[PDB]
């Protein structure tokens, strides 16, 4: 299974436009993941990481994006926040694994890496596994926006000002969410 193409990718996506790789018709060796000393987050829900290499699944999904350090907690079932409500929402019955690691050496630029964005304004909360890439001006007040940024009329996305000297809570973290479908199994452990 192409696990390296997700974890060892040169470019990562923003939270609002989180990528997804469907993995099927292969054998997945999870030992390469839970034996690595490179991850700061490794929480599996409804599954054991050790027993993962001896189970079969019909399909497994790999979602990848970039958030800051203090927002990794929101990538978990039953969490609330700007990321969990407006960017990437996990279901309360989530059966999978969440992996993350610090990426300050790659995603932080001197003048601030303004390429990584997150959605700050939205009229409703996201459904589990829903993605919104809209760029419509958010009407925070009583006057229409007409597609122009202005008074109480905001562009819905806000840029992470990722600087390498920021605090660890404000530093970029590359996150890979693994979801195992429990629905004919096409992926299995060794």
């Amino acid at each position, epitope marked *: 299974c192409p696990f390296g193409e997700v974890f060892n990718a040169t470019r990562f996506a923003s939270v609002y436009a989180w990528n997804r790789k469907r993995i099927s018709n292969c054998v997945a060796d999870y030992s390469v993941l839970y034996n690595s000393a490179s991850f700061s987050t490794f929480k599996c829900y409804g599954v054991s990481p050790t027993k993962l290499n001896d189970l079969c699944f019909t399909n497994v999904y790999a979602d990848s994006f970039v958030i800051r350090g203090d927002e990794v907690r929101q990538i978990a079932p039953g969490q609330t926040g700007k990321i969990a409500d407006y960017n990437y929402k996990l279901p309360d019955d989530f059966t999978g694994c969440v992996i993350a690691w610090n990426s300050n050496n790659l995603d932080s630029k001197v003048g601030g890496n303004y390429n990584y964005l997150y959605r700050l304004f939205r009229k409703s909360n996201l459904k589990p596994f829903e993605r919104d890439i809209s760029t419509e001006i958010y009407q925070a007040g009583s006057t229409p926006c007409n597609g122009v940024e202005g008074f109480n009329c*905001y562009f819905p996305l806000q840029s992470y000002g990722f600087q390498p000297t920021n605090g660890v809570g404000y530093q970029p973290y590359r996150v890979v969410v693994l979801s195992f479908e429990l629905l004919p199994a096409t992926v299995c452990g060794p």
Partner: antibody, heavy 124, light 104 residues
């Protein structure tokens, strides 16, 4: 809750001016800073507004390309810079603050506090 | 930009009379309107905000009304200190101003 501005300046035609507006601590977390000028014997003219908590700034149409408004959260001070000064830019420049909700980012339209004003005279 | 037209330009009245000041907009500003008073040598002082809400410490003789594009500032009975310039303000622009002077 005070707004103290820099001293009066005399600038030559074609030069640039930077007027400062120091605010009380914590103002940049629940307030936005705007700049309003008033030529002698004339009315008020809104130039632009900066939102420190979002790093967002907007300018009036007449002042786009000549005004740059910045906010230094380290010193709790806001700045305004007018590029190509000439005679009709001679005015008393005020810094004024408006309330904004730190969670919804909804800004009020009315100003609740004004500065003492800074007289900028453009002349050779 | 929405142009705010204030009418009239000058009002000559006497203390004890009612003053009605008009502010009209070329496009709807909803209720995002404020009224300010400025005396000579002073900074503007807020009187009414959000079209109809009186500011703290403002006497009850000042009243604001209107919505969208038509607004009105009303001084029920003029006091001698009320003779100054009055501005209406939208989220982006100020009005031209109305001068209230004493008739004589």
């Amino acid at each position: 809750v005070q707004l103290v501005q820099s001293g009066a300046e005399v600038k030559k035609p074609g030069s640039s001016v930077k007027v400062s507006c120091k605010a009380s601590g914590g103002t940049f977390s629940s307030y936005t800073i705007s700049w309003v000028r008033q030529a002698p014997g004339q009315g008020l003219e809104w130039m632009g507004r900066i939102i420190p908590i979002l790093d967002r700034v907007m300018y009036a149409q007449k002042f786009q390309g000549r005004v740059t408004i910045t906010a230094d959260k380290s010193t709790s001070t806001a700045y305004m810079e007018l590029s190509s000064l000439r005679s009709e830019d001679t005015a008393v420049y005020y810094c004024a603050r408006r309330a904004i909700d730190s969670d919804t980012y909804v800004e009020q339209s009315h100003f609740d506090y004004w500065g003492q004003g800074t007289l900028v005279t453009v002349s050779s | 930009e929405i142009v705010m037209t204030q009418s009239p330009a000058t009002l000559s009245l006497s203390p004890g009379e009612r003053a009605t000041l008009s502010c009209r907009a070329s496009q709807s500003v909803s209720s995002y309107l404020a009224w300010y008073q400025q005396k000579p040598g002073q900074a503007p002082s807020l009187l009414i905000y959000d079209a109809s809400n009186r500011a703290t410490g403002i006497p009850a003789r000042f009243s604001g009304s209107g919505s969208g594009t038509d607004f009105t500032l009303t001084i029920s009975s003029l006091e001698p200190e009320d003779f100054a310039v009055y501005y209406c303000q939208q989220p982006l622009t100020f009005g031209g101003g109305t001068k209230v002077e004493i008739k004589r």
